[PDB]
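The freezer alarm interrupted the setup, so I double-checked each line after restarting. Inputs confirmed:
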Amino acid sequence: YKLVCYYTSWSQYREGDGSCFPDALDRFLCTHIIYSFANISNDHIDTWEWNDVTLYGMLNTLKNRNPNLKTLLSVGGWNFGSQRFSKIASNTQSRRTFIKSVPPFLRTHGFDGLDLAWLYPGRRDKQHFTTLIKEMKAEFIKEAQPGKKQLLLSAALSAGKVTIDSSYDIAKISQHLDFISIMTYDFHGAWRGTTGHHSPLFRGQEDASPDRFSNTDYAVGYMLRLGAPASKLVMGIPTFGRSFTLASSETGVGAPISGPGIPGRFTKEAGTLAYYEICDFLRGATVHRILGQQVPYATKGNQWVGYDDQESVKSKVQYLKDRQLAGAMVWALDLDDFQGSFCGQDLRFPLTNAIKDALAAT
Amino acid sequence: YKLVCYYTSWSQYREGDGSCFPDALDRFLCTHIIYSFANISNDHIDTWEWNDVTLYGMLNTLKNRNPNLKTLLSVGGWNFGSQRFSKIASNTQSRRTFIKSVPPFLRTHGFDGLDLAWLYPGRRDKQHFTTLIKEMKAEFIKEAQPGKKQLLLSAALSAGKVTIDSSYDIAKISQHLDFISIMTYDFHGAWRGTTGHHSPLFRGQEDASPDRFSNTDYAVGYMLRLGAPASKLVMGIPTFGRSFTLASSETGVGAPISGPGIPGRFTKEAGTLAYYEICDFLRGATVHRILGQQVPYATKGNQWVGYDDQESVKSKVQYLKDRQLAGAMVWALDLDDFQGSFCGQDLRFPLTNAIKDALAAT
Amino acid sequence: YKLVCYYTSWSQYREGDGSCFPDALDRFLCTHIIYSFANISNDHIDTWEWNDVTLYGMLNTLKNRNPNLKTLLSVGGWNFGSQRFSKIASNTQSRRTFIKSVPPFLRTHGFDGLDLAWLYPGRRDKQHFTTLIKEMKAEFIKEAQPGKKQLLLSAALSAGKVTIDSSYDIAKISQHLDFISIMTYDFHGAWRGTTGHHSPLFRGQEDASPDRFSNTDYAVGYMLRLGAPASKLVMGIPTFGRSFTLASSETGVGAPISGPGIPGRFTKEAGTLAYYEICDFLRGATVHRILGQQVPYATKGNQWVGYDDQESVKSKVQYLKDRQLAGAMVWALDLDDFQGSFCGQDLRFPLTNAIKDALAAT
Amino acid sequence: YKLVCYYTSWSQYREGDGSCFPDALDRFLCTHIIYSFANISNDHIDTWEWNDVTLYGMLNTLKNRNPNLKTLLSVGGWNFGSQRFSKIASNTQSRRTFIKSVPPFLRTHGFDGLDLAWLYPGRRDKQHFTTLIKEMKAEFIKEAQPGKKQLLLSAALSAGKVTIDSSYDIAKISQHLDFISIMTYDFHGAWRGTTGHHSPLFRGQEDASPDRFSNTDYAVGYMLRLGAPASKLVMGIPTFGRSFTLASSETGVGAPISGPGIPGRFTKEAGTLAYYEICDFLRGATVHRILGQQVPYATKGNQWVGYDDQESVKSKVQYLKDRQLAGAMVWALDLDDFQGSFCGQDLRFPLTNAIKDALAAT
Ligand SMILES: CC(=O)N[C@@H]1[C@@H](O)[C@H](O[C@@H]2O[C@H](CO)[C@@H](O[C@@H]3O[C@H](CO)[C@@H](O[C@@H]4O[C@H](CO)[C@@H](O)[C@H](O)[C@H]4NC(C)=O)[C@H](O)[C@H]3NC(C)=O)[C@H](O)[C@H]2NC(C)=O)[C@@H](CO)O[C@H]1O
Ligand SMILES: CC(=O)N[C@@H]1[C@@H](O)[C@H](O[C@@H]2O[C@H](CO)[C@@H](O[C@@H]3O[C@H](CO)[C@@H](O[C@@H]4O[C@H](CO)[C@@H](O)[C@H](O)[C@H]4NC(C)=O)[C@H](O)[C@H]3NC(C)=O)[C@H](O)[C@H]2NC(C)=O)[C@@H](CO)O[C@H]1O
Ligand SMILES: CC(=O)N[C@@H]1[C@@H](O)[C@H](O[C@@H]2O[C@H](CO)[C@@H](O[C@@H]3O[C@H](CO)[C@@H](O[C@@H]4O[C@H](CO)[C@@H](O)[C@H](O)[C@H]4NC(C)=O)[C@H](O)[C@H]3NC(C)=O)[C@H](O)[C@H]2NC(C)=O)[C@@H](CO)O[C@H]1O
Ligand SMILES: CC(=O)N[C@@H]1[C@@H](O)[C@H](O[C@@H]2O[C@H](CO)[C@@H](O[C@@H]3O[C@H](CO)[C@@H](O[C@@H]4O[C@H](CO)[C@@H](O)[C@H](O)[C@H]4NC(C)=O)[C@H](O)[C@H]3NC(C)=O)[C@H](O)[C@H]2NC(C)=O)[C@@H](CO)O[C@H]1O
Ligand SMILES: CC(=O)N[C@@H]1[C@@H](O)[C@H](O[C@@H]2O[C@H](CO)[C@@H](O[C@@H]3O[C@H](CO)[C@@H](O)[C@H](O)[C@H]3NC(C)=O)[C@H](O)[C@H]2NC(C)=O)[C@@H](CO)O[C@H]1O
Ligand SMILES: CC(=O)N[C@@H]1[C@@H](O)[C@H](O[C@@H]2O[C@H](CO)[C@@H](O[C@@H]3O[C@H](CO)[C@@H](O)[C@H](O)[C@H]3NC(C)=O)[C@H](O)[C@H]2NC(C)=O)[C@@H](CO)O[C@H]1O
Ligand SMILES: CC(=O)N[C@@H]1[C@@H](O)[C@H](O[C@@H]2O[C@H](CO)[C@@H](O[C@@H]3O[C@H](CO)[C@@H](O)[C@H](O)[C@H]3NC(C)=O)[C@H](O)[C@H]2NC(C)=O)[C@@H](CO)O[C@H]1O
Ligand SMILES: CC(=O)N[C@@H]1[C@@H](O)[C@H](O[C@@H]2O[C@H](CO)[C@@H](O[C@@H]3O[C@H](CO)[C@@H](O)[C@H](O)[C@H]3NC(C)=O)[C@H](O)[C@H]2NC(C)=O)[C@@H](CO)O[C@H]1O
Ligand SMILES: *[C@@H]1O[C@H](CO)[C@@H](O)[C@H](O)[C@H]1NC(C)=O
Ligand SMILES: *[C@@H]1O[C@H](CO)[C@@H](O)[C@H](O)[C@H]1NC(C)=O
Ligand SMILES: *[C@@H]1O[C@H](CO)[C@@H](O)[C@H](O)[C@H]1NC(C)=O
Ligand SMILES: *[C@@H]1O[C@H](CO)[C@@H](O)[C@H](O)[C@H]1NC(C)=O
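Predicted 3D structure, all chains:
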């Protein structure tokens, strides 16, 4: 089973124990470690952080004691911007320039492939997106013909029905992508006005959630139906939780909230909490395993965080193995308890190690 | 909470360890023990089995050490005959004789009330089935008026949506009934040619499911939605399992079957298995928990059986308490392991007890 | 058969033949004419437009040469505030003030009753909405007891399942209201990115529709199913259409759009078109009757509009009669071709009259 | 567009004007005519009727004036039996003989190809079927490699979901079939106990029919999504109706029935009525266009029949062209008023010619 893992280039700028660099990663932990993100400056694939070229190294050095580890540089990401990408892909001009720059840059940097993280193609870029991947793959071949090891091409697609529909021609692109990562998380926003787990495995109580398709099972399922093969499907699994600030003494699912949740001391970003920050939170908190959804949420004071733990990621892995999917995708190494400290026990990458073990065992 | 348990009056004619009598029941176990079924002969409520009077005897004795235990006589039942019931429902005189015959018959025999087990009113009986309940309650009130402890009136209702829409006016009946037991089991017929748990808590995997309403959760929310007060809703929980005979090596949910499972040694009814027989079956068997449904199934050789155990009833109880229901109803005590034997430890009524415990434990 | 027609107070300000005043309405056309909308200022039901008092009189005049026309004052409306209305229903004191102020304001200004257009009660206002409807009917009773002709109480409910599920306890409110108007229209938002009739009668082609509940039939049947007396259900039918702007040369249902259609010279609101404006659009347009849904749509150049016409409303009246519903509701009189010029024959209210005629014949 | 029309071999043994012979068929009517059915005296496709070999000619003579019509011989039918086919195709040896024995038979009898009517393949026949069609086409090429015009190979398949899943590898079988006639009719059995059109276009009113997939629209789309190519999909249209015998004064859709309708004069088979018997029945009868399904049901006295008229088959034709299908299929040429006397006009094949005109017109 393929175990895809992300690393963000911005997890370095975090206070004390929170800062994370490519060298803090377990060489043997994943089958694919993806660097994110990569910018596109002048229809070309450029670095992002000033030291991205150093870090690109710190990461590839992990291949040294483990030649099985593969790596991909992800281009795009939430920030980049939907429009920027849109243009660079619409005309054939910039599109060829870009496709062109990719192969060498990756080569001259120790990367085993490319990860397309366009978020997301308007309904107007669906045909384009298809081409962009068709051609980009055509190119990846034109380079490896000299006898090299061909560069891997993947994409992080949305898991929400609407988008999946108004942006992807799964049946087609599924052919050129070496594997797909369905980002099955970020399903219940603070705008809804109620508490909701952002990454539930199943729908759960039929009338406790607005629609039937804001969960992992539906997404995974829906996409298989649209033609995506199982062998090219990696199921995303967040190692972060989405929080809210309650507005009443009520604390169950669908309870009233008044905004996202207070910012973690390290990731500092209302609505988010890294697993290691959740671990602190837990002390004195009250955990509730949501029945039909197979995931846990914790509450304490006026805070409510829906997340995943070892038990839930394990459930989640058993789920994918069943559907006999390509494997799990994590987001992101730097959000799990990579130190090994916070969640105690001294062992590190708990949620990802749970995912790792569950994948290899029946 | 209410813990309504059913006791079938034919569980006596069961070979050796199978045979079950009113006296073999834990008088402290339930809050209401319903005896079933009673016939309606000559538009008069009347006994069924040659020795019912003796059994109404053994059962009602259980109220001695435990004065809080209530008992009711259930009239109707699956084999009774859907037609025969309507006949009495729509005859202005048939109904009247019937209603008038109950109060005396109950006081004469020791019951605290009646329970309507009409399966199932037709689309044409929706109204007759509402009048019935309405007048019967009147008769219970008229008889009690002097200063007596009023006779209890309940109805066991279908969990099948189609049935609920064609046969009931939940809205109205709900007010004249003391409680409503919703038969939330028997959801997956063998005629589908595929294995399926007959009593899932939730729908489970979105596509592996037949429809959208063959699971406890839907059934409850629908009835609550339709008007039945939570305080009057009893959630049906089966202590028997639904078996299928496999047709291949596939053993998962949806596997192909060639017919109902093999009859039990004691229940002798293809497609059915008492929990105590499921326990003999479990020896050398493989049990799997169905992820999306919170219920488990077990397979061995060419038999597949979906049933409930301590774990699943606990969740179902957790579920019902969350929904703030009136309690759980069990069908039936003579299908739970009542000798205590069959499942080790030799403790009696594992299922009901597990339910009892979970009902008063938070 | 009841024929409830809405008259908006803002259609008075439209340019040219668009300006619509109460005295421009056919006094024999409808059975009930609801004036909309009225504000609630300082917990008191009040006028909205500076000259509401003048217009109320122009409307109520119509009752003269015809003493069977009933009129109502609709309070609420889309532009009112799901929140403002909530704080008045939640506060026990505010609720009384309001309820108390209605009978006088109603008798004073010459109205037959009230119409509640709270769009829409939150997940948390379900019971408050019921209480609010309960107590207001309790007042219209008290005020009429001396011997007066009881003030009428109605409500314009959502046709959308999600909304209906989180705000309406149909069973209960349905017994206090005199009739319910189900707004069966506004079903395919332009956000979907695709063309789609906003008021289909049935789902039509299965895989060409977004969901199973966005159509009249489902809504009508869902409410009936939920306990609303057909005798009290008024099926809304729209005299306006919802436009879009095509992004390609594709013009059938499901074609990609780039946003709402161009605004009309008179209604001047993107994505909306009154019928009389549609009659203008049809000049050199191409009308197609969507088969599975019984409703038309027209397209010309890059505009696409899904509306209702005489043939389609007739089908709709047929559908409601087979269903045995209290009648039809029309939103709005001023969006129909009230002048009678645009749509030919110089006959006025072509759509509404078609509705009336169809109701009258069997 | 193709136009496959079947001919029954038993359409001769019928009284008076009800006798149908190959020489009675309009040679410029269909583009294909499938003689049905043909037996197999154990691994060798042997005729069925004593004069079968005489009729094969009568049909074929129709090629003399219209050299551009083709004929296939259909082997199977409803009576051939489920087991006979399975047992004959399951035996690797038994098969070969059959496959090998088909071509020479057709070639010697003027038939241009085969048609497979296996009703139906259980779960234990899915692959066999796939193979049978596979190897079957293989042989057709071999025999035709000299320079001869190749033999066609079509298949009549169930339009019912459950049947399709449990037995059709649409993805594969479709690459070998020159075309697929989807038997989109026979949805409502008399076992249901209520009236219902056996061949609706769309499901119509949501709570007036059991499931979402017992109509033409669903079946087709379902098939298309399963891999069936619109270019290789012929949609069946029935030229007969399905009668029921009413049990009360209710005559609408879903009114109670007490068995199938009285046998037709000429077809002499309960629950069935050919169009010519229907046209007759229609005198003094009342027709009703079922609103959501685009189909008529007529009722007179205690009889109820749902069927297709010119108006409705034309709608279904517009439907398939919208779905860009291979064409329409009919059943059967001897059920349509081939006489031209029953439906008056003195014109022949009223429905099929309506189907034809409609196919080439827009
Ligand atoms: C069900 C549905 O469709 N709902 C919509 C939501 O999907 C959507 O939310 C956005 O969802 C995307 C993925 O679907 C998400 O981005 C991916 O996931 C991670 C984690 O959120 C992102 O990581 C962030 O990266 C940025 C830099 O670009 C950092 O600034 C930020 O700190 C990171 N946050 C975390 C938790 O790590 C990645 O960018 C991306 N991963 C990959 C491989 O592409 C967006 O973050 C979601 N939006 C946010 C910020 O909440 C939502 C949009 O608001 O709309 C719903 O309708
Ligand atoms: C979703 C849906 O619509 N499901 C339909 C099923 O409801 C229906 O199957 C019948 O379901 C009812 C419960 O609603 C069931 O009867 C009740 O439940 C128990 C459990 O079966 C019955 O026990 C049997 O009693 C008879 C005598 O009355 C005995 O002969 C038999 O041995 C008993 N079996 C067991 C396991 O104990 C009770 O009769 C009754 N209990 C109460 C409280 O009233 C029927 O038995 C189910 N039918 C059968 C025989 O399977 C199904 C129609 O068959 O249709 C589904 O769609
Ligand atoms: C299936 C589903 O749930 N869809 C949701 C939509 O229903 C919802 O859109 C809003 O829907 C309500 C009724 O369903 C509608 O309000 C009523 O309908 C009329 C006609 O649209 C409204 O008329 C408008 O009134 C405002 C001021 O009140 C005017 O400014 C405007 O010009 C009027 N438009 C027209 C064409 O006349 C009335 O307000 C009201 N009438 C009654 C009987 O109460 C809202 O207007 C709809 N909102 C909009 C902007 O369309 C939608 C909202 O987000 O969400 C969907 O999911
Ligand atoms: C949802 C679903 O799948 N529904 C099931 C039904 O399919 C099934 O009913 C049988 O359906 C098949 C079609 O799929 C039907 O046979 C075809 O259709 C015609 C007319 O139905 C048949 O014609 C008859 O043939 C027999 C002998 O072959 C003659 O004796 C008789 O005179 C003929 N009658 C007519 C109308 O001409 C054909 O045999 C066949 N056509 C082709 C090209 O293959 C069966 O007749 C249907 N069975 C009946 C008679 O009801 C049903 C089984 O009970 O189950 C549903 O669920
Ligand atoms: C806007 C963005 O890309 N994200 C921000 C980060 O880039 C930023 O990191 C800091 O970047 C600057 C360069 O832009 C680093 O400064 C460099 O420091 C080295 C020290 O050896 C020196 O040789 C360079 O001259 C100097 N760069 C220049 C030319 O200015 C700085 O070290 C980075 N931060 C640190 C201390 O690691 C951080 C803020 O620091 O914010 C991100 O949002
Ligand atoms: C169809 C039905 O009601 N259920 C069946 C049971 O009735 C049946 O049980 C036996 O029924 C007979 C007849 O009612 C019983 O006979 C009576 O036995 C007593 C014993 O003291 C005797 O005094 C009576 O004279 C005698 N009466 C009759 C009518 O003959 C018999 O005791 C019952 N035996 C059992 C098992 O208790 C069983 C047969 O095993 O099958 C049920 O399906
Ligand atoms: C926001 C709103 O209520 N809708 C807008 C309308 O109010 C507006 O109508 C105009 O409103 C003004 C203010 O009420 C009217 O002025 C009044 O004119 C009469 C004339 O006899 C005079 O007696 C009043 O004193 C005066 N009111 C005061 C105190 O200012 C004005 O006549 C209205 N215009 C007309 C003729 O319709 C319209 C204008 O476009 O827009 C609505 O959106
Ligand atoms: C079992 C079967 O094939 N289905 C039955 C039909 O065969 C049957 O039709 C009649 O079949 C007989 C043959 O069995 C025909 O008789 C033939 O008549 C000709 C006259 O020229 C004579 O030369 C033949 O020798 C003779 N057959 C023999 C060898 O005995 C008879 O004409 C057929 N009837 C018709 C209408 O043509 C029908 C009804 O009889 O029932 C089917 O079940
Ligand atoms: C990415 O490229 C854009 C376009 O040239 C540029 O404006 C931006 O600075 C680049 N991103 C960063 C911050 O390196
Ligand atoms: C039930 O009563 C009816 C008389 O109304 C009778 O026909 C039937 O045999 C009785 N069944 C039993 C076993 O008592
Ligand atoms: C409606 O009443 C509210 C509160 O009294 C007020 O703020 C608002 O301006 C009023 N609207 C109009 C136009 O009367
Ligand atoms: C072949 O068809 C004939 C009809 O003439 C039938 O009687 C026979 O049973 C079929 N197969 C055999 C050889 O039995």
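Quick read of the result. Residues 239-308 of chain D form a domain with the Chitinase A; domain 3 fold (CATH 3.10.50.10).
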